[PDB]
Amino acid sequence: QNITEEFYQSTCSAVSKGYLSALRTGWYTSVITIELSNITDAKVKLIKQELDKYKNAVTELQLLMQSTPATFLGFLLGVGSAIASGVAVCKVLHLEGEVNKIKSALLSTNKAVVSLSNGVSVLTFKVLDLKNYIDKQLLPILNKQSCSISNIETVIEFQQKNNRLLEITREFSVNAGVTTPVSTYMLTNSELLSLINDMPITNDQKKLMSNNVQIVRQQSYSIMCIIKEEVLAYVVQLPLYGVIDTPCWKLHTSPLCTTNTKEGSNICLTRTDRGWYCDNAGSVSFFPQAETCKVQSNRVFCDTMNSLTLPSEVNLCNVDIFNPKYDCKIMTSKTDVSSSVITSLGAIVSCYGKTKCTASNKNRGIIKTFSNGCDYVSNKGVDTVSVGNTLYYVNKQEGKSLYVKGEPIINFYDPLVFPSDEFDASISQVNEKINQSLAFI
Amino acid sequence: QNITEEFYQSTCSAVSKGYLSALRTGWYTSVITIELSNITDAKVKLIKQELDKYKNAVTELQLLMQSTPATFLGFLLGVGSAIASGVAVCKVLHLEGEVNKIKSALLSTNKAVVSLSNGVSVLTFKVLDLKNYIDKQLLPILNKQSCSISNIETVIEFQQKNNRLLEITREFSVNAGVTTPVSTYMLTNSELLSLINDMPITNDQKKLMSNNVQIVRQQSYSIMCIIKEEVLAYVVQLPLYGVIDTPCWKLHTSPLCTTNTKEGSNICLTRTDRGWYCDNAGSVSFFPQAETCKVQSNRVFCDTMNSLTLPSEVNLCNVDIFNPKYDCKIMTSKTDVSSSVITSLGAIVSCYGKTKCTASNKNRGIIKTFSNGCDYVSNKGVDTVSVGNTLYYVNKQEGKSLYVKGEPIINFYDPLVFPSDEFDASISQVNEKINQSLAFI
Amino acid sequence: QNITEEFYQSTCSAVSKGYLSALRTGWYTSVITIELSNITDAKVKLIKQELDKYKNAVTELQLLMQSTPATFLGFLLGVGSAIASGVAVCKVLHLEGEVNKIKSALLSTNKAVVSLSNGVSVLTFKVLDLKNYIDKQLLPILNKQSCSISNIETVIEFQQKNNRLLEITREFSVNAGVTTPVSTYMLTNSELLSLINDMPITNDQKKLMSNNVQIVRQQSYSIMCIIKEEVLAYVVQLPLYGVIDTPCWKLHTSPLCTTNTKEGSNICLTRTDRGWYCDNAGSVSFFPQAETCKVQSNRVFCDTMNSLTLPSEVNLCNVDIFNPKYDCKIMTSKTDVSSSVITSLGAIVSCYGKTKCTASNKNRGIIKTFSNGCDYVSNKGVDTVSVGNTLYYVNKQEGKSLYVKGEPIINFYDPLVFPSDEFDASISQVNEKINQSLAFI
Ligand SMILES: CS(=O)(=O)CCCn1c(Cn2c(=O)n(C3CC3)c3ccncc32)cc2cnccc21
Ligand SMILES: [Cl-]
Ligand SMILES: [Cl-]
Numbered sequence A, B, C: 001q002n003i004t005e006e007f008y009q010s011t012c013s014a015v016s017k018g019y020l021s022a023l024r025t026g027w028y029t030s031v032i033t034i035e036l037s038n039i040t041d042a043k044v045k046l047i048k049q050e051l052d053k054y055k056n057a058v059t060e061l062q063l064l065m066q067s068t069p070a071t072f073l074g075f076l077l078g079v080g081s082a083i084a085s086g087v088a089v090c091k092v093l094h095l096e097g098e099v100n101k102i103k104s105a106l107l108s109t110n111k112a113v114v115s116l117s118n119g120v121s122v123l124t125f126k127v128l129d130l131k132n133y134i135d136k137q138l139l140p141i142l143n144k145q146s147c148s149i150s151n152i153e154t155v156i157e158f159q160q161k162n163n164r165l166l167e168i169t170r171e172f173s174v175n176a177g178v179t180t181p182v183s184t185y186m187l188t189n190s191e192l193l194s195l196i197n198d199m200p201i202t203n204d205q206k207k208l209m210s211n212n213v214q215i216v217r218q219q220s221y222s223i224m225c226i227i228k229e230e231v232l233a234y235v236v237q238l239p240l241y242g243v244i245d246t247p248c249w250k251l252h253t254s255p256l257c258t259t260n261t262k263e264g265s266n267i268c269l270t271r272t273d274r275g276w277y278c279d280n281a282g283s284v285s286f287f288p289q290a291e292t293c294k295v296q297s298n299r300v301f302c303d304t305m306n307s308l309t310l311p312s313e314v315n316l317c318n319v320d321i322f323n324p325k326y327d328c329k330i331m332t333s334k335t336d337v338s339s340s341v342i343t344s345l346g347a348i349v350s351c352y353g354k355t356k357c358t359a360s361n362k363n364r365g366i367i368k369t370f371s372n373g374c375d376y377v378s379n380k381g382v383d384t385v386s387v388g389n390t391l392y393y394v395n396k397q398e399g400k401s402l403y404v405k406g407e408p409i410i411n412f413y414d415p416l417v418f419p420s421d422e423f424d425a426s427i428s429q430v431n432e433k434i435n436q437s438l439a440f441i
C-alpha cells in the first residue's frame, strides 16, 4: 500500500504511516502427537544402530519431562507468562485417561478435535506413526528371521522416518522442552497450513496466517508435554490475531540540541515515545521496542504482550507537542552527540559539535552536507548517510516524504533553568520544574 | 513442594516462596576429544565424497583456532568473563607434550583423569575414534584394491560416524569456536550423564545434575581448543552447583500510583528490587534479571555471576518497606500507565486512567472488574487477566495466595514536594529530598 | 602483540591497550544462486519421496517471498537498518530480465561479476546445479523405464545434493528469510574463501577476512531474495572492513564509593564511558556495548553502526578525569553495593559494606583480602576473585599491568550537596549542581 512519512523539524521526529495491523491478542493450543512403538549381518547392524537412536531419544524425552515446563519506554511494560496457556493444557494431559482420549480420537484419522476434561476444545494431530512403521516392517526382520533377512532400502527409509524424532528431541534438549520459533521438525509447512485451515478462526485470519507462515512460526511455541502409552505429545501454541487491518504508524525520534559554540553549554531534548503505534479498539496499542514488531511489506505483526494501551490523543504529540490533551513524553540532557536514525522513507540526522554529517548517492557521492542541528533527508535520490565514522544505508522503498518546517522547540528553553538528566519526563513536568526554578530566583 | 504467595497491597508487590536453590557457583572443565586419521565406481565415489567432507572439516577447525577463544537493577551487576576457566585450561593444552599426555591416557580406555602440567586435574573423554574407523575399514578399500571392492553398507556407516564431526564443526563455525548451550553433538545424553557420574562432586550434585540434564546443558559451554597429533579436543565447561536446597523466593513489583481525576496530577512509586532471591551463606543472593534463572517445578537454577550479595535484612522490605534495618529501593515517577504483572500464583494489576482492567474465567468470562489502583487476584478460579488491549494468561499451578491488606504507601506523600523521575533511589533518599524541599518552603 | 593494562585508583577504572582494529564500515552484497529443475519399486519410491522434499522446499521458499525482507551509554546510539543495502539489491533482482542476466552470466562458469541495471556491480555465484543433476540422472529413471531401473547409489547421492537445499530452506523458514550468522549451508567455507578472494578489496582485507572466516560469518547476513526462471537466489551481505590496524583500547569502570560506617551516608560515582575505543580517522570510535565487539587475540572486530564518533580528547579522561578539554561522563548514586569487573589482565573490585572480597590462587587459596573501597589485582599469580557469594575467574593471558596510585575522587565531594541519582551526567554538570546547591545555602 501507500507508505508515507512526515518529518517534524520542530521536534526532531518522523512518523511513517500507511501500515496495517496484525496483532497477536490470544493463543490457540494444539496437541501434536507422534505414536511410538514399544520394544548379525551388516544391514541388520545398521537397523539395530538406528533403533538404538530411537530408544535413547525416547528415554531422553522421558528424562526431560521430570519437571513442568517453564521459560526508551520498555521499562513501562507489564510482565506476562507467555506459555501459561500451553502449560495449562499440558497439565491437563497428565490427568488419567486424558492421553487415552487422544489416542482413541486419532485411531482412524490424523486430524481430530478433542474436548478435554476441563472443557478445553483443542485440535489434535498425529504427524508421525512410528508405532506402525516399526511394528510392521522392522519387527518382522528382528524376530522372524533372527536378524537375517533385510534389505538396505528399508535401512534408508527407517533413517528417514526416525530422523524427525531425533531432531525434535535435539531441539527440546538444547531448549529445556520449550522452543520458539516452531521449526519445520515440530510442524512441517504442510502440517501447519493444514492446522491453520482446520483452526476455528475467520477466513481473514486463515488467509493472513497462511500467507505469513514464517511470522506465525516466530510467534509460536512448541512445549514438550508428555510421553505416555506409546504416545509422544507436545503442545504447539499458535498466535491468535484478534486485531487485523487497523492503521499502524512508526514514530522515529532523535536528539534535538542547541548548537552553541562553547561546548558544554548546550541543552538537549528527545521525544521518548518512539516505537510502533496501532489503532486498537478505540485506544492505541503502543509498542516501545519496535524490534518486537515484524514488518512484511505494509503489514506489521506485533504482540500485545509488549504493548501499552494509550489514549488515542497520544497521536497529537506529532503535530503539536504542546497540545493540551496529552502530556507528551520527552527526556532531557546536555549530551549533544551526533547520530542518525534511519526511518522507513528517509533519515533523521542529529548533527552536533565537530561531526561531519552528509548524505550521498550511489554514483555521485556527497549531495548534501548537514549543518549542526536536527535535519532530515528522504530516501529519494539518497542511498547512504554518514554521521562521523558511521555509514548508514537508507531504506529504498517507494513512498513520499513530507518535510514539515518548524522552529526546534529546544530554542524555547532558557538553558540556565533547564532541567537536564530527566528520563521518564514530559512537556508539562519539565515546565513544572522550570517554573519552580524561576520561582526560587 | 508447597508454593505460596503473598500480595502486599501497601506496596503493590508479591512474593512467591517455597522454591529451593540450585546456584551455579563454579565451573568444571573437561577435555572432550575425537581421534582423527591422517590421510572409480559409484560406491567408492561416495566414500571419496564423504572423505572430502571429513578432510575439509579438519581444515576448517584448524583455520578456526588461529586465535585464542573469547566471547530494574541489572545495571548494578559486576562483569565476569564466563569462559575464563575453560580458556585457561585450553591454553595449557597447547604446551608441548600436553596433548600427548591425553592421547596416551585414553589409549586403552575412553574415560580418564589427567593431571595437566600446571596441576589441574581434568576428566578426559574420547567420544569418537575416527582414526580407528578410517584406519581399519576405509584405508583397505582405497589402497589395496585401488578403489575397487566396496559395499554400500559401509558408505551408510561412514556417513553416520562422520556426521557428528561435520555437525560439531558446523556449530563451531557459526559460533566462533564457543557454543552454549552444549548440544548433543558436543556431548550426547549418555556421555554427559556418564561424565556427571565420574565427576568429583557430591551424590546430591550428581542426582541434581542427572535429573536436570537440559538445564546443565544450558549453563555449559563448549570451547573449541586444539587439533594436534591426530587429536581433536574441545573443552566442555560444566556448572558447579555449590549452593543447593536453600530457600528461594521471587519478588514481583508493579507501579503504585495515586488515582486522582485530573490527569497529570498523580504520583507513582515502584519497588525496584524485583527478581529472584535465594538464601546463600548467611547473605541473600539477589538476581535482578529473573530471566537469568530457570525454574523447574519448585527448583530454581541461577548463576551467581548475575547476582548481588545482599544482607538478609533485604527481606524486611516485603513486610515493612519503612523498616529501619534495610533502606528499601524504589523508583518514582508521574507516569500512571496501566499494566499487569503475572506472578507465580496470581496477577498484580496496576490500573489507572481510563483503562479497562478485568479478570476472567475460561467458561464464564468476566468475574472481576478492577477499580483504579494496584490490586491482585489469585489464579484459583481465574484464567486470564485483561489490562487495556493486552490479554494475559495466568499461571495455573497449585498453591495458596494470601492477600495482605494495607494502605498504599503512595498516599503518605505530598504530591507538591514529591520527587518524580528518581530511578536508583530508596525510601530514605526520597524522604531526604522531601525534607529538603519542605525546608526551602 | 603486547597487551598492557593500567588501573586508575582515583577513578576505579582500567584501560587495556595493545589491540588493533577491524571495524565493519560498509557492506558487500553478493548474489548466491542455486539452479532449479522444473518437473513402483523400493528404490524408486525413495527417489519420489526425496523428490517430494525438493518440490515442497521450492513451494515453501516461493511462499516465503510474498513480502519484501525486513528485520551504560548504549541509549546514545543512532538507529540503522542493517540489511538496507542487501534488500536494495534484492529489489533490483525482481525487475524483469534482471534474473535472466545472471542466469546467462553463469551459464559457462560458477563465479561471475554482473553489472545490474541500476549500475551496481555484484559478484555472482552458482553454488549448486540441481537443474543439471535432476535433469541428467533422475529424469531418465522416472520417464524412460516408467519408474523401473534404478540403483541405490543414486538415492544416496540425491539425498546428499538435495540436503543443502532442504537446510537452506529450514534456516529461512525459522528466520523469515533473513539469517545471521551466515551458516555453511548458505555458503561453505570453500565458497566463502573463494568469494573473499574474488572480492574487490585490498590484499590486507583479503588476508584479514580469510584468517577470520568465523567472524566474517557472524557479521554477515543471508537475505532470501527471489525464485524465478528455475533460479533460486539469495543475497549474502558481507562486511567491509574499511578501518584496519588502528589502536584500540578497552575501558573498564566500576563504582567508586565512600566507605563510611553509618550505612546510607555514602556517596558513589561511576565512570559511564566504559566500552571499546578505536582510533578512527582523526576521531575515536566509541562502542558503549563492548559485547558488540569480538576479540580474536589482539584483534578486535566491531561494527561502526553501534558506535559514537567522539573527539580523541575523550582519552584524557583516563589520566585526568578533571581535564579541561573533554567533560568526562559519570553517574552518581548512593547505592554502595559490592561487585567486581574482570578486565583483560586483572580484576577491579568495588568492595563496600559487610562484603567479603578476596583474590585467590589455584593451589594456595586466599592471597589477598580487599578492604572497603575500589581496588585492583592483576592476573599474574591470581586465578579467581570473590565478591560476596560470586566467584569470578580472571582472564589468564600474558601482559603487564600497572597500578597507578591516586586519591579516589569521591573524597573530593561534600556528601550533603552531592547530587545522587544522576545517570547521563558529567564532571562539569555535577559541579554545576553542587555550586547551585552551595549558592542556595
Ligand atoms: C533505553 S534505556 O531505558 O535502557 C536508557 C535509560 C537509562 N537512563 C537512566 C536510568 N534508567 C534506566 O536504566 N531505566 C531502565 C531499565 C529500567 C530507567 C527507567 C526509568 N527511569 C530511569 C531509568 C536515567 C537516564 C537519563 N537520561 C538518559 C538515560 C537514562
Ligand atoms: Cl547499513
Ligand atoms: Cl499470555
Ligand SMILES: [Cl-]
Binding pocket: B080, B081, B082, B083, B084, B085, C391, C392, C393
Ligand atoms: Cl567465571
